[PDB]
Write an enzyme that holds these catalytic residues in place. Structure first.
Site, PDB file in Angstrom:
ATOM      1  CG  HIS D 233      -2.063  -1.093   1.303  1.00  0.00           C
ATOM      2  ND1 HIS D 233      -3.429  -0.790   0.663  1.00  0.00           N
ATOM      3  CD2 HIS D 233      -1.686  -1.915   1.427  1.00  0.00           C
ATOM      4  CE1 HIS D 233      -3.967  -1.503   0.629  1.00  0.00           C
ATOM      5  NE2 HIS D 233      -3.696  -2.848   1.073  1.00  0.00           N
ATOM      6  CG  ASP D 267      -7.846  -9.943   0.009  1.00  0.00           C
ATOM      7  OD1 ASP D 267      -6.949 -10.131  -0.303  1.00  0.00           O
ATOM      8  OD2 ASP D 267      -7.730  -9.196   1.316  1.00  0.00           O
ATOM      9  CG  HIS D 268      -6.581  -8.446  -3.863  1.00  0.00           C
ATOM     10  ND1 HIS D 268      -5.478  -8.905  -3.380  1.00  0.00           N
ATOM     11  CD2 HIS D 268      -7.345  -7.795  -2.019  1.00  0.00           C
ATOM     12  CE1 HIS D 268      -4.908  -8.320  -2.720  1.00  0.00           C
ATOM     13  NE2 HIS D 268      -5.941  -7.594  -2.012  1.00  0.00           N
ATOM     14  CE1 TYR D 334     -11.606  -7.761  -0.398  1.00  0.00           C
ATOM     15  CE2 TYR D 334     -11.391  -5.598  -1.477  1.00  0.00           C
ATOM     16  CZ  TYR D 334     -11.088  -7.208  -0.230  1.00  0.00           C
ATOM     17  OH  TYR D 334      -9.132  -7.040  -0.125  1.00  0.00           O
ATOM     18  CE1 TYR D 467     -15.410 -29.841 -11.376  1.00  0.00           C
ATOM     19  CE2 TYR D 467     -14.968 -28.602 -12.790  1.00  0.00           C
ATOM     20  CZ  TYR D 467     -16.054 -29.357 -12.757  1.00  0.00           C
ATOM     21  OH  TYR D 467     -16.797 -30.669 -13.216  1.00  0.00           O
TER      22      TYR D 467
HETATM   23  C1  HEC Z   1       1.616  -2.539  -4.545  1.00  0.00           C
HETATM   24  C2  HEC Z   1       2.475  -1.772  -4.426  1.00  0.00           C
HETATM   25  C3  HEC Z   1       0.499  -2.494  -5.572  1.00  0.00           C
HETATM   26  C4  HEC Z   1       1.643  -2.878  -7.104  1.00  0.00           C
HETATM   27  C5  HEC Z   1       2.549  -2.597  -7.958  1.00  0.00           C
HETATM   28  C6  HEC Z   1       0.265  -2.720  -7.865  1.00  0.00           C
HETATM   29  N1  HEC Z   1      -0.663  -2.206  -6.774  1.00  0.00           N
HETATM   30 FE1  HEC Z   1      -3.001  -1.767  -8.051  1.00  0.00          FE
HETATM   31  N2  HEC Z   1      -3.682  -1.362  -6.119  1.00  0.00           N
HETATM   32  C7  HEC Z   1      -2.825  -1.914  -5.155  1.00  0.00           C
HETATM   33  C8  HEC Z   1      -3.594  -1.319  -3.756  1.00  0.00           C
HETATM   34  C9  HEC Z   1      -3.249  -1.374  -1.637  1.00  0.00           C
HETATM   35  C10 HEC Z   1      -5.651  -1.026  -4.348  1.00  0.00           C
HETATM   36  C11 HEC Z   1      -6.481  -0.554  -3.387  1.00  0.00           C
HETATM   37  C12 HEC Z   1      -6.005   0.761  -2.724  1.00  0.00           C
HETATM   38  C13 HEC Z   1      -6.919   1.314  -1.528  1.00  0.00           C
HETATM   39  O1  HEC Z   1      -7.515   2.149  -1.686  1.00  0.00           O
HETATM   40  O2  HEC Z   1      -6.670   0.308  -0.264  1.00  0.00           O
HETATM   41  C14 HEC Z   1      -4.833  -1.016  -6.177  1.00  0.00           C
HETATM   42  C15 HEC Z   1      -5.757  -0.934  -6.002  1.00  0.00           C
HETATM   43  C16 HEC Z   1      -5.842  -1.096  -7.959  1.00  0.00           C
HETATM   44  C17 HEC Z   1      -6.839  -0.368  -8.437  1.00  0.00           C
HETATM   45  C18 HEC Z   1      -8.355  -0.102  -8.688  1.00  0.00           C
HETATM   46  C19 HEC Z   1      -8.644  -1.261  -7.709  1.00  0.00           C
HETATM   47  C20 HEC Z   1     -10.595  -1.262  -7.882  1.00  0.00           C
HETATM   48  O3  HEC Z   1     -11.187  -0.461  -7.966  1.00  0.00           O
HETATM   49  O4  HEC Z   1     -11.727  -2.157  -6.738  1.00  0.00           O
HETATM   50  C21 HEC Z   1      -6.397  -0.693  -9.944  1.00  0.00           C
HETATM   51  C22 HEC Z   1      -7.778  -1.214 -11.165  1.00  0.00           C
HETATM   52  C23 HEC Z   1      -5.441  -0.902  -9.259  1.00  0.00           C
HETATM   53  N3  HEC Z   1      -4.881  -0.729  -8.677  1.00  0.00           N
HETATM   54  C24 HEC Z   1      -4.461  -1.634 -10.890  1.00  0.00           C
HETATM   55  C25 HEC Z   1      -3.095  -2.256 -11.069  1.00  0.00           C
HETATM   56  C26 HEC Z   1      -1.884  -2.625 -12.218  1.00  0.00           C
HETATM   57  C27 HEC Z   1      -3.035  -2.931 -13.183  1.00  0.00           C
HETATM   58  C28 HEC Z   1      -1.309  -2.738 -11.569  1.00  0.00           C
HETATM   59  C29 HEC Z   1       0.248  -3.278 -12.261  1.00  0.00           C
HETATM   60  C30 HEC Z   1       0.049  -1.986 -13.834  1.00  0.00           C
HETATM   61  C31 HEC Z   1      -1.266  -2.207  -9.985  1.00  0.00           C
HETATM   62  N4  HEC Z   1      -2.204  -1.966  -9.999  1.00  0.00           N
HETATM   63  C32 HEC Z   1       0.733  -2.424  -9.909  1.00  0.00           C
HETATM   64  C33 HEC Z   1      -1.666  -1.990  -4.771  1.00  0.00           C
HETATM   65  C34 HEC Z   1      -0.475  -2.442  -5.715  1.00  0.00           C
HETATM   66  C1  HEC Z   2     -15.522 -28.179 -14.469  1.00  0.00           C
HETATM   67  C2  HEC Z   2     -16.810 -29.223 -14.610  1.00  0.00           C
HETATM   68  C3  HEC Z   2     -18.320 -29.389 -14.627  1.00  0.00           C
HETATM   69  C4  HEC Z   2     -19.218 -28.596 -13.915  1.00  0.00           C
HETATM   70  C5  HEC Z   2     -20.589 -27.819 -13.549  1.00  0.00           C
HETATM   71  C6  HEC Z   2     -18.755 -29.968 -15.373  1.00  0.00           C
HETATM   72  C7  HEC Z   2     -20.037 -29.933 -15.914  1.00  0.00           C
HETATM   73  C8  HEC Z   2     -17.636 -30.955 -15.991  1.00  0.00           C
HETATM   74  C9  HEC Z   2     -18.113 -32.152 -17.141  1.00  0.00           C
HETATM   75  C10 HEC Z   2     -16.691 -32.933 -17.108  1.00  0.00           C
HETATM   76  C11 HEC Z   2     -17.103 -34.042 -16.758  1.00  0.00           C
HETATM   77  C12 HEC Z   2     -18.063 -35.330 -17.140  1.00  0.00           C
HETATM   78  C13 HEC Z   2     -15.705 -35.026 -16.896  1.00  0.00           C
HETATM   79  C14 HEC Z   2     -15.347 -36.274 -16.375  1.00  0.00           C
HETATM   80  C15 HEC Z   2     -14.704 -37.123 -17.870  1.00  0.00           C
HETATM   81  C16 HEC Z   2     -16.243 -37.454 -18.660  1.00  0.00           C
HETATM   82  O1  HEC Z   2     -16.353 -38.592 -19.683  1.00  0.00           O
HETATM   83  O2  HEC Z   2     -17.351 -37.795 -18.245  1.00  0.00           O
HETATM   84  C17 HEC Z   2     -14.391 -34.166 -16.398  1.00  0.00           C
HETATM   85  C18 HEC Z   2     -13.729 -33.976 -16.377  1.00  0.00           C
HETATM   86  C19 HEC Z   2     -12.940 -33.368 -16.960  1.00  0.00           C
HETATM   87  C20 HEC Z   2     -11.146 -32.721 -17.324  1.00  0.00           C
HETATM   88  C21 HEC Z   2     -10.711 -34.333 -17.590  1.00  0.00           C
HETATM   89  C22 HEC Z   2      -9.733 -34.909 -16.392  1.00  0.00           C
HETATM   90  C23 HEC Z   2      -8.747 -35.888 -16.726  1.00  0.00           C
HETATM   91  O3  HEC Z   2      -9.591 -36.860 -16.669  1.00  0.00           O
HETATM   92  O4  HEC Z   2      -7.952 -35.759 -16.858  1.00  0.00           O
HETATM   93  C24 HEC Z   2     -10.600 -32.051 -17.814  1.00  0.00           C
HETATM   94  C25 HEC Z   2      -9.622 -31.408 -17.890  1.00  0.00           C
HETATM   95  C26 HEC Z   2     -11.994 -30.970 -16.646  1.00  0.00           C
HETATM   96  C27 HEC Z   2     -12.349 -29.874 -16.957  1.00  0.00           C
HETATM   97  C28 HEC Z   2     -12.981 -28.719 -16.716  1.00  0.00           C
HETATM   98  C29 HEC Z   2     -12.640 -27.515 -16.074  1.00  0.00           C
HETATM   99  C30 HEC Z   2     -11.181 -26.379 -16.483  1.00  0.00           C
HETATM  100  C31 HEC Z   2     -10.503 -25.620 -15.448  1.00  0.00           C
HETATM  101  C32 HEC Z   2     -13.762 -26.364 -15.635  1.00  0.00           C
HETATM  102  C33 HEC Z   2     -14.167 -25.460 -14.877  1.00  0.00           C
HETATM  103  C34 HEC Z   2     -14.281 -28.568 -14.953  1.00  0.00           C
HETATM  104  N1  HEC Z   2     -14.178 -29.430 -16.225  1.00  0.00           N
HETATM  105 FE1  HEC Z   2     -14.507 -31.061 -16.342  1.00  0.00          FE
HETATM  106  N2  HEC Z   2     -13.327 -31.812 -16.932  1.00  0.00           N
HETATM  107  N3  HEC Z   2     -15.853 -32.759 -16.219  1.00  0.00           N
HETATM  108  N4  HEC Z   2     -16.822 -30.197 -15.753  1.00  0.00           N
HETATM  109  C1  HEC Z   3      -3.400  -6.389   3.258  1.00  0.00           C
HETATM  110  C2  HEC Z   3      -4.219  -5.416   3.720  1.00  0.00           C
HETATM  111  C3  HEC Z   3      -4.304  -4.816   5.573  1.00  0.00           C
HETATM  112  C4  HEC Z   3      -3.406  -5.774   6.162  1.00  0.00           C
HETATM  113  C5  HEC Z   3      -3.973  -5.654   7.717  1.00  0.00           C
HETATM  114  C6  HEC Z   3      -4.567  -3.687   5.519  1.00  0.00           C
HETATM  115  C7  HEC Z   3      -4.154  -3.126   6.257  1.00  0.00           C
HETATM  116  C8  HEC Z   3      -5.249  -3.034   4.125  1.00  0.00           C
HETATM  117  C9  HEC Z   3      -5.822  -1.989   4.198  1.00  0.00           C
HETATM  118  C10 HEC Z   3      -6.736  -2.231   2.630  1.00  0.00           C
HETATM  119  C11 HEC Z   3      -8.395  -1.749   2.424  1.00  0.00           C
HETATM  120  C12 HEC Z   3      -8.504  -0.484   4.011  1.00  0.00           C
HETATM  121  C13 HEC Z   3      -8.844  -2.196   1.072  1.00  0.00           C
HETATM  122  C14 HEC Z   3      -9.572  -1.930   0.488  1.00  0.00           C
HETATM  123  C15 HEC Z   3      -9.973  -0.913  -0.087  1.00  0.00           C
HETATM  124  C16 HEC Z   3      -9.929   0.590   0.528  1.00  0.00           C
HETATM  125  O1  HEC Z   3     -10.036   1.331  -0.175  1.00  0.00           O
HETATM  126  O2  HEC Z   3     -10.453   1.484   1.599  1.00  0.00           O
HETATM  127  C17 HEC Z   3      -7.529  -3.424   0.751  1.00  0.00           C
HETATM  128  C18 HEC Z   3      -7.797  -2.992  -0.616  1.00  0.00           C
HETATM  129  C19 HEC Z   3      -6.180  -3.644  -1.118  1.00  0.00           C
HETATM  130  C20 HEC Z   3      -6.294  -3.903  -2.724  1.00  0.00           C
HETATM  131  C21 HEC Z   3      -7.504  -3.722  -3.550  1.00  0.00           C
HETATM  132  C22 HEC Z   3      -7.995  -5.022  -4.170  1.00  0.00           C
HETATM  133  C23 HEC Z   3      -8.892  -4.304  -4.934  1.00  0.00           C
HETATM  134  O3  HEC Z   3      -9.726  -4.015  -5.233  1.00  0.00           O
HETATM  135  O4  HEC Z   3      -8.790  -5.103  -6.331  1.00  0.00           O
HETATM  136  C24 HEC Z   3      -5.118  -4.420  -2.977  1.00  0.00           C
HETATM  137  C25 HEC Z   3      -4.803  -4.903  -4.187  1.00  0.00           C
HETATM  138  C26 HEC Z   3      -4.312  -4.722  -1.437  1.00  0.00           C
HETATM  139  C27 HEC Z   3      -3.935  -5.756  -1.646  1.00  0.00           C
HETATM  140  C28 HEC Z   3      -2.689  -5.797  -0.201  1.00  0.00           C
HETATM  141  C29 HEC Z   3      -1.548  -6.619   0.470  1.00  0.00           C
HETATM  142  C30 HEC Z   3      -0.779  -6.887  -0.732  1.00  0.00           C
HETATM  143  C31 HEC Z   3      -0.390  -9.173  -1.197  1.00  0.00           C
HETATM  144  C32 HEC Z   3      -1.583  -6.737   1.622  1.00  0.00           C
HETATM  145  C33 HEC Z   3      -0.407  -7.705   1.566  1.00  0.00           C
HETATM  146  C34 HEC Z   3      -2.907  -6.112   1.943  1.00  0.00           C
HETATM  147  N1  HEC Z   3      -3.431  -5.312   1.321  1.00  0.00           N
HETATM  148 FE1  HEC Z   3      -5.093  -3.755   1.149  1.00  0.00          FE
HETATM  149  N2  HEC Z   3      -5.287  -4.115  -0.795  1.00  0.00           N
HETATM  150  N3  HEC Z   3      -6.563  -3.250   1.235  1.00  0.00           N
HETATM  151  N4  HEC Z   3      -4.868  -3.953   2.587  1.00  0.00           N
END
Ligand code: HEC
Ligand code: HEC
Ligand code: HEC
Ligand code: HEC
Ligand code: HEC
Ligand code: HEC
Ligand code: HEC
Ligand code: HEC
Ligand code: K
EC number: 1.7.2.6
Lengths: 503, 56, 502, 504, 56, 57
Positions: D233, D267-268, D334, D467
């Site tokens: 952050h 969580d993301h 979320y 799944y």
């Molecule tokens: C860590 C240092 C980060 C890096 C590197 C990037 N992102 Fe990020 N992003 C980060 C946080 C902690 C947040 C939420 C901030 C908050 O309000 O607490 C975000 C936010 C975004 C969003 C919007 C999320 C939303 O609206 O729900 C986007 C679309 C986003 N970030 C994109 C993004 C991309 C494409 C990045 C790589 C180039 C990237 N971020 C870097 C943390 C960090």
């Molecule tokens: C998620 C599920 C699902 C969602 C609900 C549905 C309807 C299917 C259907 C099947 C069936 C049926 C099987 C059994 C095989 C058969 O002929 O009867 C199951 C297999 C499966 C494979 C093969 C695994 C192996 O044998 O090594 C693979 C690669 C699957 C992948 C998809 C998948 C992509 C991430 C998702 C989402 C589901 N399947 Fe499936 N499927 N599937 N599947």
């Molecule tokens: C771990 C947590 C945490 C540790 C305790 C704290 C204090 C935060 C704070 C936030 C808050 C608040 C949010 C909500 C957004 C807002 O403005 O109020 C949460 C967002 C979050 C994102 C964005 C998710 C999206 O919208 O797509 C990202 C990418 C986060 C990731 C960091 C993370 C890096 C691996 C760690 C550790 C935490 N956060 Fe966060 N944060 N965060 N965060």
């Protein structure tokens, strides 16, 4: 004669290998391919579900109609010009592709490792002349938008609102007959000795049929969730999942990443296991030293490839490479499926083991390969044994009627599903205490953790059958099943003692 | 037809006994009882398998 | 003398640095290496387990014998020719390897960044000549099939059924004395001040010994499961786990991926943590810009490497690079091991910290490096405190005899294991209510989630010690432990009320 | 004027965009940027927490002081020379950076795909002339250690013990006014119609503010755990998280890996979802064929890129690319946040949908993109529904006071947190039965598993909403919640029967 | 501030767009008595409308 | 011979007191009681640790 297609396919098609023309073979394959009785359409539970918007791309032959606008009538050249900013990258990717550069393929030299493509071009041309789509003295100029999306080698104008189609497997197969036929031959080769799985399954040829014939997929109200399953199960319908639109690169489809989107996750972690293995880590490390453009047959020599990949292992069979991936399958991912473990020592499985040994011995010694494959088989059974002990406990509870909420809060699954114990439905639908926690837990023990244990063993990732996947998670499930079992017995006896005091 | 069900532990014991005498004793691949790996007489497991192959 | 081998190794082998020859150093190293007392063979529990088919490749010195077929007497050239058909890719991999192109190494010019290899070849020749395997002025022609798999620099025929061996650490060590000695020196450098771990451990030198001396590994019936553990624990026996057969590329072994198959998973997610850090994400983005062929000492200059890697961090010590990975170890992955936390303040640990600071300060400022390493140490202890509180609850129940099934359904572990609370055995063997769920949960809290928390911290992956691994999962375990404890307390009280109604 | 900065930014700062100079624009931005009322400093709960050693790098403007050693004064060349031995790789990385080879940029020809950089340098110079840090005839010679770490275009010596700073967003923004202004504009563009989230959030502009304004972060005693949150952050404070020090490579920041350390996890799981999707697998397979050095606007033409990336999708808006990543945000990760689901059908959300569709049509047809985004919206609501039914059960138990340990062992969370049901604090703090297992389970059902479900849908990884993530884990939570609910119901029924037997 | 509308109600509202008040649609989320619940579009539209009237 | 066991919380309090006076009062890194982080006097934790360092020689 397409010599890479099995006799069983020609026989099932009622065709003579030597006499059949490309036109005749294509027509017979398509006739079966598009027959509802052979898996096409909405399937047996079609009255329970409706397509969503994305379904027109997942099953085009059943659902697709062209857009109402733009109202345009376009030549071959017009498709390119207008889409050049309407869908820019499709045009650029196509322009980069072999399909747009057929003359370059004609200019190839016999000492080029990519020369095979010239033979394949002429094969396509031979197919098309037989189908009447190409003149006897006419060369195929290109494979452009209008060819795949309207009609192969179309000379005139198309109506965008009427003539546009999504290219399905049969569309590609008009030119790529060999590959389409090889893929379709999975229907005929994947036959289990005791019907462990339905005939032709598991396969890419029937992946969509398998999907729509799964009860929860058709029965569950959450259509957008169900359709995620569909996205992994579209190979039947469209040929662009390994070599993607619109580059259609063979080199791309040879890379392990091409299989990863579908062959991954909680009930089959093939991507995860392979990439973590030495085989897969070497593939990551060496990807820039290998010539991916070379055909799989040449990969280990002219390609410089020294570690195995998904395609090289699974598309190989008895020294040749085809789009049929079924012929060496023995365990089929899920080791608990009735008849599978029992069949592992049959002549049928042994012959398939021999074929695997041949694959491995391109690199390893036979003694080495057989030693590990023995470990794989026995480790899988050891995992199965662990689950079977746990299931004996929980299944007993179900039959005794003692699962939590079983007689109090177990509502029936959605039609046309019937109630039962530890059924696939309970992974994608739940309500009240259907399923119970114990029931889900032992189901996931087999469905997820045993399956991943086998995958780990098959793809040589030690952690993937020991600590992290397989034995570790199954150990916990066993422990928690036994724990809840004992707690529930103790509570049952306490309830019995309160009953006594009341009587 | 359909194969008669054989438990994984029995498949394992059959495999361990697949090249030796009916009188020979091998260790289980799965079972622990009384703080020891269960021993299996090879004659007993092969007999249980052969009757199940007959019922197949 | 080998410059990169520590004094304590020579002392442990009864050798004088300024006097000992390569031949003498090798023979002493191997004498300890093959000694059962020093860890070789089947170990102390060898009567409880038997090898399986793959075991002949896992521990070749104990288990390997050549195949009964083919019955072939063969020369050097015959190896290559027949195996061109039998194992074709092994031949092609070998043919493109340095081992098969030694004259190319001899032709390296002083303006080639790979020039160091020429000197390494000459050191190899020096070693062999000292041992009497090579003539004083005879160039080593190649390292081929017959050399590793029969005998170094063999000129005559080999019997396929009798003379074929699987090449072990001492086989490689015949030529690569430096690296083998460096590796073996882990026995002498990894000594804990209070015996926190057994002497020489943890290490690659004793990875196989540690495996076979684990009770559950020896005791469990599922041999094929137990052998998965063995596959991650073979460095002691064979040298091809980082630089694989049959290319044996040093560049390969320098890449983070070479460590990943073993250094990953629920109880040590180093691969996962490292790759997800900035450090590792940069290594992924920049891998095409770096020269991996360059030796580690030159990585940050000649190689152009601008982000750290497993090898660069862990093989570095006081400005030098060696095959010894033990000299900066302080936490050793599992923070709950008795004596480890208490030892973190000692002069022993502080000296090793200083060595780490030296590693980081190739790029970062000292103030920055020490700021983060302080965070790592304290964050780790914070995790440990969380587990210790939860462990106090479950351990009290065990002492009380109140764990689910403890007196009614708690069967003894397989021999020679002894029954006990939250023991390693309970992760690979379970029967009845041994272990109880609470018991396994609190064991996994420390074994898996505390360990990953520390790994996350050590390798600079924020999510790996907060939300995703470490703190988040440990929080759930804590919550669920307290919940079950309270539930079981009130159920006990309810049973007591029924008791006094009877 | 800065053409890529929104009207609402100039309006918020009371600037006329047709008239304001670079200097005036910069100063207005920085005045807001450094104001405690706008998010700077320790925040509202500053009396509850103290910085740790690394915090001087995480929030320099509040916490950074130069080191006491070395006790030396140094000129421009002395920075390079001494640090060439003291922090060798930093000098090495700096030397191969654009910042240290500005003449290379000046000599870029019009047929070079990287020519755009010449214009960027000239804009940077104009900014510095407006600010009086550069002469009207004077070219910017370099961007060296002394420039970022002491003062831009410093001509004399610096006191290592007094003058050294950690470069923050405003430091970079002195030269890179456009990018800094674009970034800061997130404050003004991310305004929710019904206050679903605080104004300007979520964004990179306020990621640090959001972090320090989170109660548990300020309240918990495990500071080193809390500072792990901080490390994700820091964008608000420093500009080196996507394009890292000391190479500061634009190419690197365009790669999906650049976003992964922060945008991943329980969580993301954006990195995990994206890489597993076809989009991400193609990005992995095709990375060597693409020219990452071209600007995002040229990526699909000059770059050769045929699969989408984090940066290309999220920095794009109506055919242009800016450091503002907020203008198409609809779900905001979320789906359970009050008012978010209810807002998905509004004209505001629908206009942002049209913007997304545009982004997709770089490749896919409009009809295809709309078909999938409809799936994404509805799949997300289907997951939300599943959670909501589960929450009704556990929330009822809370209201009834029947949760395990609720009245016997539920200690209050650390100050200044208030006790409650299923609060964020319970993810990072627990004691006794605060929270209860059922309570934590349903919390994580929404916080982790529903959020990951949406991420999987949004980033086209089928397994990530079915799944493996999303639906499967939510199904398990639902099942286990129902099971425990039933078990506890019949246990209290049994206890009631015992109570009757005690009536005697 | 928007008045609360449940996710299932949102889905049913979406399903009922461009349809008549008397038209009946399937639920996206609800199963009762072994069948997907059916919803009349008039009911869901009305419930949503009385929530938009109570929204700020 | 082994070191005398010192709990992680005590190890943390001990470390929190490095370069601090014995009369300095620091916050715990682990403990919350009555809705507040427990405070620890540096002299007390140093004495607790010294006893343990003397318990193991
Ligand atoms: C860590 C240092 C980060 C890096 C590197 C990037 N992102 Fe990020 N992003 C980060 C946080 C902690 C947040 C939420 C901030 C908050 O309000 O607490 C975000 C936010 C975004 C969003 C919007 C999320 C939303 O609206 O729900 C986007 C679309 C986003 N970030 C994109 C993004 C991309 C494409 C990045 C790589 C180039 C990237 N971020 C870097 C943390 C960090
Ligand atoms: C998620 C599920 C699902 C969602 C609900 C549905 C309807 C299917 C259907 C099947 C069936 C049926 C099987 C059994 C095989 C058969 O002929 O009867 C199951 C297999 C499966 C494979 C093969 C695994 C192996 O044998 O090594 C693979 C690669 C699957 C992948 C998809 C998948 C992509 C991430 C998702 C989402 C589901 N399947 Fe499936 N499927 N599937 N599947
Ligand atoms: C771990 C947590 C945490 C540790 C305790 C704290 C204090 C935060 C704070 C936030 C808050 C608040 C949010 C909500 C957004 C807002 O403005 O109020 C949460 C967002 C979050 C994102 C964005 C998710 C999206 O919208 O797509 C990202 C990418 C986060 C990731 C960091 C993370 C890096 C691996 C760690 C550790 C935490 N956060 Fe966060 N944060 N965060 N965060
Ligand atoms: C401009 C005047 C066009 C010409 C000439 C052609 N097409 Fe087109 N196409 C155009 C638009 C504006 C759209 C978008 C429609 C939408 O609602 O998304 C399309 C779409 C397609 C598609 C995808 C259809 C779908 O169901 O998603 C295809 C496969 C396609 N167009 C192909 C195509 C071909 C083969 C053409 C030449 C014969 C052609 N287009 C001409 C605009 C224009
Ligand atoms: C054919 C005429 C051969 C010649 C000449 C040599 N080898 Fe060989 N080898 C051959 C076969 C058919 C096999 C497979 C045996 C099996 O059961 O798998 C092998 C095996 C090996 C091995 C591996 C042994 C193992 O236990 O897995 C090695 C290391 C090996 N061969 C090496 C080798 C050397 C050094 C040779 C020259 C002296 C040589 N082989 C000759 C066939 C033939
Ligand atoms: C040697 C004689 C130096 C000269 C000349 C300059 N610096 Fe320096 N610097 C030097 C050392 C030994 C250290 C490490 C201090 C520590 O305890 O880690 C530093 C540190 C820095 C830092 C980082 C400070 C921090 O808080 O981590 C920076 C940003 C820095 N130095 C920059 C810098 C500049 C801009 C200089 C020229 C004016 C300069 N240094 C001169 C040694 C020496
Ligand atoms: C990740 C989310 C980023 C953060 C945080 C910051 N920047 Fe960035 N930057 C990022 C990308 C994906 C790009 C390429 C954009 C494009 O249109 O091609 C950039 C580019 C720049 C540049 C221009 C360099 C060039 O293209 O030659 C500058 C000057 C720049 N970025 C500066 C900058 C500043 C001052 C930031 C803090 C406010 C900042 N960036 C943050 C990704 C990300
Ligand atoms: C699986 C287990 C296992 C299966 C049963 C067996 C027998 C082992 C044994 C050990 C022991 C012992 C240790 C501790 C070290 C020691 O000397 O006493 C354990 C360590 C371990 C490491 C080091 C972790 C660290 O300190 O950073 C690693 C990398 C392990 C790797 C393998 C692994 C590969 C995926 C699998 C399978 C197991 N181990 Fe182990 N081992 N091991 N291990
Ligand atoms: K590359």
């Amino acid at each position: 004669d397409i010599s890479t297609v099995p006799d069983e396919t020609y026989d099932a098609l009622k065709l003579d290998r030597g006499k059949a023309t490309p036109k005749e073979t294509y027509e017979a394959l398509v006739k079966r391919y598009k027959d509802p009785a052979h898996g096409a359409g909405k399937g047996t539970m079609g009255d329970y579900w409706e397509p969503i918007a994305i379904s027109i791309y997942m099953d085009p032959n059943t659902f697709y109609k062209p857009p109402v606008s733009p109202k345009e009538v376009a030549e071959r050249k017009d498709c390119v010009e207008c889409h050049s900013d309407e869908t820019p990258v499709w045009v650029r990717a196509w322009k980069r592709s072999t399909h747009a550069n057929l003359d370059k393929i004609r200019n190839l030299k016999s000492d080029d490792p990519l020369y095979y493509k010239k033979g394949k071009l002429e094969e396509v041309e031979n197919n098309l002349r037989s189908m009447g789509k190409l003149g006897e003295k006419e060369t195929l100029k290109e494979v452009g938008c209008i060819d795949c999306h309207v009609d192969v080698n179309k000379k005139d104008k198309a109506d965008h609102t009427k003539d546009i189609r999504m290219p399905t497997a049969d569309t590609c197969g008009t030119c790529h007959l060999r590959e389409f036929a090889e893929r379709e031959s999975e229907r005929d080769t994947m036959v289990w000795p005791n019907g462990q799985w339905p005939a032709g399954r598991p396969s890419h040829a029937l992946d969509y049929t398998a999907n729509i014939e799964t009860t929860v997929w058709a029965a569950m109200p959450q259509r957008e969730v169900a359709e995620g399953c569909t996205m992994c199960h579209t190979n039947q319908n469209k040929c662009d999942n390994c070599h993607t639109r619109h580059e259609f690169s063979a080199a791309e489809s040879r890379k392990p990443e091409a299989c990863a989107t579908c062959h991954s996750g909680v009930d089959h972690n093939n991507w995860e296991a392979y990439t973590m293995s030495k085989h897969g880590k070497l593939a990551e490390m060496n990807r820039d030293k290998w010539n991916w453009e070379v055909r799989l047959k040449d990969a280990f020599s002219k390609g410089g490839q020294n570690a195995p990949t998904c395609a090289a292992c699974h598309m190989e069979y008895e020294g040749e490479y085809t789009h049929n991936i079924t012929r060496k399958t023995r365990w089929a991912n899920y080791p608990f499926v009735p008849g599978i473990a029992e069949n592992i020592t049959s002549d049928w499985s042994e012959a398939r083991l021999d074929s695997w040994v041949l694959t491995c011995t391109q690199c390893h010694s036979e003694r080495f390969a057989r030693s590990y494959l023995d470990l794989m088989d026995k480790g899988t059974l050891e995992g199965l044994a662990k689950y079977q002990e746990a299931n004996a406990i929980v299944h007993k509870m179900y039959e005794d009627g003692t699962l939590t909420g079983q007689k109090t809060n177990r509502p029936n699954p959605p039609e046309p599903e019937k109630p039962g114990f530890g059924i696939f439905t309970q992974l994608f639908w739940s309500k009240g205490n259907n399923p119970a926690s114990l029931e889900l837990k032992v189901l996931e023990m087999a469905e997820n953790n045993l399956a991943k244990m086998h995958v780990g063993l098959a793809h040589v990732n030690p952690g993937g059958w020991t600590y992290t996947e397989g034995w570790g998670p199954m150990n916990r499930a066993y422990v928690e099943i036994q724990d809840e079992y004992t707690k529930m017995q103790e509570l049952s006896a306490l309830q019995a003692r309160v009953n006594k005091l009341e009587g | 037809s359909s194969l008669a069900p054989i438990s994984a532990k029995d498949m394992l014991d059959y495999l361990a006994c697949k090249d030796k005498k009916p009188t020979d004793v091998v260790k289980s691949h799965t079972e622990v009882e009384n703080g020891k790996i269960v021993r299996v007489k090879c004659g007993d497991i092969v007999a249980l398998v052969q009757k199940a192959r007959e019922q197949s």
